[PDB]
Write a protein that binds this ligand. Structure first.
Ligand SMILES: [Mg+2]
Ligand SMILES: [Mg+2]
Ligand SMILES: [Mg+2]
Ligand SMILES: [Mg+2]
Ligand SMILES: [Mg+2]
Ligand SMILES: [Mg+2]
Ligand SMILES: [Mg+2]
Ligand SMILES: [Mg+2]
Ligand SMILES: [Mg+2]
Ligand SMILES: [Mg+2]
Lengths: 86, 63, 131, 93, 53, 273
RNA sequence: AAAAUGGCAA
RNA sequence: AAACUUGAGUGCAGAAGAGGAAAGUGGAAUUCCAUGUGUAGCGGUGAAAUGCGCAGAGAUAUGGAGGAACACCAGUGGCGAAGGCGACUUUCUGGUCUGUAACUGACGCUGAUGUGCGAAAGCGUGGGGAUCAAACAGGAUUAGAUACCCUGGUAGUCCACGCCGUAAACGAUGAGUGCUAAGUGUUAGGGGGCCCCUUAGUGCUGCAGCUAACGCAUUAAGCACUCCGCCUGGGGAGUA
């Protein structure tokens, strides 16, 4: 995604100011990235190499979501509903 | 030798810049090897893209 | 990833001892410090130094070499491993090299040599053998 | 994004006709969400190799800045259709 | 195109022509593409040539 | 675009059909409809002159603008519709003045697309220009042989022709057959290719569906009597038993050319199919 | 250019 | 249960790349076709012949058509998980590396079963067809010649979308991590004075150590820990 778009995403989901490492922040950027590649994959269905990149992001997002659930159930539930991932 | 581009501190090679390109092409119009020219690897790649673009626009001869 | 910190400590010493390096620096943990102190006590290693790196600290172990460039530590082996843990009762406590070697054992009392464990009649997990 | 476009016009074209062509295509380059930063006519030059049985051609270079590539694509379509433009190339950078 | 010099031997000009052809390496290229070789083989020969250099 | 029927019956087994997704309106325009009675291969004398034509579903003829002579007025495509009388689909196009006409629907034509005809028209699908104006290497359709008559070539589904070159008054084109022929530059052709490309792939599946389309059965000459066919007669199945396969009317039917000689088109035709 | 073959043990 | 930042991510500032997908545009060459010139061969082999040509071939000049592949650059160069990826342009798009230390705070590693990708050949449907070329046909060779060589030549070779799921798919070397002499070349960086230092690759050489030996050797086949896959005489048999 565009750096500007990413910067908008981080500001929305940041737990505190100057936070780029929050699970919520990282998940949101991944979610936006995942959707972007999917749209590309819809136009270009034979781009197997790009899809592999998507699969890694999906797995990373899943792993971050798993960590968040363990750390805080409320925050996890807030993130999944906010990003519409479930 | 020494890379002309490194020596002259030029970081961009232009296809429109025929005169620069002409130095690094042979009389047959073949792109000269980087060893003979003494150009750096990075700049040899730039030179080839510039030469090929200029050849397309008929600025440089294919043969 | 690193799965056994202790095994690495023993291996570093082994690798350094092979090339006859005077000193080694390793990442420091409380258990590793205790093992190092025992080795110095037994005279296998000459000296131990600890420093704070603002992370987990750094340990410096000074290896001891006999005359004619002899090595005091012949070998180190990790008896208890992350994959399979070995625990021994005081009666079953092992002797290394017929008592010439030492066996590091983790006990309720603390990390101690095999001889000490048998003396106190306290069994423990056998961390390693050094001979 | 900024794109540099170079188009070669046929040598036999009339001077009045050439002027009409360059004006049209420069418009096409700035049609949609685009600004022409500069437009420069290199003029008649000997072609390194003969193109469309022409040993010479008029070179025109135009620099266009746009957020979209719609204008450049529009130029390319019409340039292909146009008989006058013997050679054309669009380069971003 | 090599052009025979004025008041120059044809054989001398032919020698100059031969040198120019050698510089071009056109003959060499023709001999390479006389027979097809497998794509892997081409890379191997190229690598071997580089090792020779 | 092909719907493959599951083998619920032996008749439906192997039967395929078009999805008909492209069709937007299922109803024809009342004004542009004219009656089309069936002839069943019967001439003015009333006798059968072309065999295997008869029956079939009733059809109303749709009026189509093959001429594409309305110039300078832009037309917006209202709908793509199913025409019973042709392999291609047809497009209801409404001109700015308010005239509604049908045209052969080009491939990639969409509802709301604007189409224009004339010399000044842009080279985009659905636009009809004189051949001279059309660039070389352009796929074209609905090509007029005679100027002003209306397009007679490349009207079928998935049909196109390519402009090859200009030769004075004439323009060279390659037809789908593979024939290269000269056509007057004044003649027009629509830009693009005709749609309904998957029409050929359809598997009719059963005999009855052929009967719906007005095709009556074909009896082979071999299974006829001598008086009926040259291939007729014989005890049991018979081989052709003649130097060549023959037509029902006693003319050789394999490889024998039939184009009439001394035709003006012969000079126009450069390369045969 | 062509250019085949040679019992098993000892 | 509560802390920490080294691992692992994220930000920010940079770098290189035949990484991938979709369109568009070039030039060389091959083949075929049409004419001009011209003439008795051309072509091919060890030598021949088939073949082609005298109904004007081959060659040469000009023009057109069409497909395929991109000379030079080009490099133990680069990129990718692997298979692979070499004209140029644009659009869409993945990964990696350097620096900094914003942030997060062990969120890691491996990975049964699964789930995808996967050379070439092959298969289905539609298209295309220049070159090359299984099969097939002449010629030759030979004791024979179902070959090797020669002249042709179909599928295939190409495109799209499915299918197949295998290759000495190889580094015959699973993945993650740490440690253990040096010398030298090169690719993309970083820092400090042509030199030095440093990071991630990619080669060569060579200790300690290892190894049945050959060899490997900071790109381990050395020394260690975790996890997975796999083997336990040959043949029968990758068969029933
Ligand atoms: Mg019939
Ligand atoms: Mg009968
Ligand atoms: Mg009869
Ligand atoms: Mg009969
Ligand atoms: Mg019979
Ligand atoms: Mg024998
Ligand atoms: Mg294949
Ligand atoms: Mg052959
Ligand atoms: Mg296998
Ligand atoms: Mg290195």
């Amino acid at each position: 995604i565009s750096q500007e778009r990413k910067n908008e995403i981080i500001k929305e989901y940041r737990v505190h100011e100057t936070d780029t490492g929050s699970p919520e922040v990282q998940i949101a950027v991944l979610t936006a990235e995942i959707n972007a590649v999917n749209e590309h994959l819809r136009t270009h269905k034979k781009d197997h190499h790009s899809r592999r990149g998507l699969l890694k992001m999906v797995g990373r997002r899943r792993h971050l979501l798993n960590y968040l659930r363990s750390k805080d159930i409320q925050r996890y539930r807030e993130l999944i509903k906010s990003l519409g991932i479930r | 030798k020494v890379c002309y581009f490194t020596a002259n501190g030029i970081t961009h090679i232009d296809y429109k810049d025929t005169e620069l390109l002409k130095r690094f092409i042979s009389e047959r119009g073949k792109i000269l090897p980087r060893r003979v020219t003494g150009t750096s690897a990075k700049y040899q790649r730039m030179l080839t893209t510039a030469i090929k673009r200029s050849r397309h626009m008929a600025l440089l001869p294919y043969v | 990833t690193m799965t056994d910190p202790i095994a690495d400590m023993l291996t570093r010493v082994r690798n350094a001892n092979m090339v006859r390096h005077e000193k080694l620096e390793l990442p420091a943990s409380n258990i590793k410090k205790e093992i190092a102190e025992i080795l110095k006590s037994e005279g296998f290693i000459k000296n131990v130094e600890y420093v704070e790196d603002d992370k987990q600290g750094v340990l410096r172990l000074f290896l001891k070499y006999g005359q004619n460039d002899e090595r005091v530590i012949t070998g180190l082996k990790r008896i208890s491993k992350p994959g399979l843990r070995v625990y021994a009762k005081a009666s079953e406590m092992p002797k290394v090299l017929n008592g010439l070697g030492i066996a590091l054992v983790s006990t309720s009392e603390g990390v101690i040599t095999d001889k000490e464990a048998r003396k106190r009649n306290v069994g423990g997990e056998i961390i390693a053998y050094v001979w | 994004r900024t794109y540099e476009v170079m188009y070669i016009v046929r040598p036999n074209i009339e001077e009045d006709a050439k002027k009409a062509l360059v004006e049209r295509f420069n418009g096409i380059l700035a049609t949609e969400g685009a600004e022409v930063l500069e437009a420069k006519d290199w003029g008649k030059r000997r072609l390194a190799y003969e193109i469309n049985d022409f040993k010479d051609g008029f070179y025109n270079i135009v620099r266009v800045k746009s957020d979209n590539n719609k204008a450049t694509d529009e130029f390319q379509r019409l340039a292909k259709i146009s008989d006058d433009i013997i050679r054309y190339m669009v380069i971003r950078e | 195109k090599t052009v025979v010099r004025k008041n120059e031997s044809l054989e001398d000009a032919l020698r100059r022509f031969k040198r120019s052809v050698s510089k071009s390496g056109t003959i060499q290229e023709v001999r390479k593409r006389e027979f097809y070789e497998k794509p892997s083989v081409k890379r191997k020969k190229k690598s071997e040539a580089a090792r020779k250099r | 675009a092909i719907k493959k029927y599951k083998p619920i019956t032996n008749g439906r087994r192997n039967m395929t059909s078009l999805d008909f997704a492209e069709i937007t309106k299922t109803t024809p325009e009342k004004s542009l409809l004219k009656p089309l009675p069936k002839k069943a291969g019967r001439n003015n004398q009333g006798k059968l002159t072309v065999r295997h034509h008869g029956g079939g579903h009733k059809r109303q003829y749709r009026v189509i603008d093959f001429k594409r002579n309305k110039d300078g007025i832009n037309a917006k495509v209202d709908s793509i519709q199913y025409d019973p009388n042709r392999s291609a689909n047809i497009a209801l196009v409404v001109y700015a003045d308010g005239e509604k006409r049908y045209i052969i629907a080009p491939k990639g034509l969409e509802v709301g697309q604007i189409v224009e005809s004339g010399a000044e028209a842009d080279i985009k699908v659905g636009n009809a220009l004189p051949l001279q104006n059309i660039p070389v290497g352009t796929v074209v359709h609905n090509i007029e042989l005679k100027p002003g008559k209306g397009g007679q070539i490349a009207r079928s589904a998935g049909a196109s022709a390519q402009v090859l070159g200009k030769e004075g008054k004439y323009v060279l084109i390659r037809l789908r057959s593979g024939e290269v022929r000269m056509i007057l530059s004044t003649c027009r052709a629509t830009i693009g290719q005709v749609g309904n490309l998957q029409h050929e792939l359809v598997n009719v599946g059963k005999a009855g569906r052929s009967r719906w389309k007005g095709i009556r059965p074909t009896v082979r000459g071999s299974v006829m009597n001598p008086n009926d066919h040259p291939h007729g007669g014989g005890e049991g199945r018979a081989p052709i038993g003649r130097p060549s396969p023959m037509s029902p009317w006693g003319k050789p039917t394999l490889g024998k050319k039939t184009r009439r000689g001394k035709k003006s088109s012969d000079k126009l035709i450069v390369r045969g199919r």
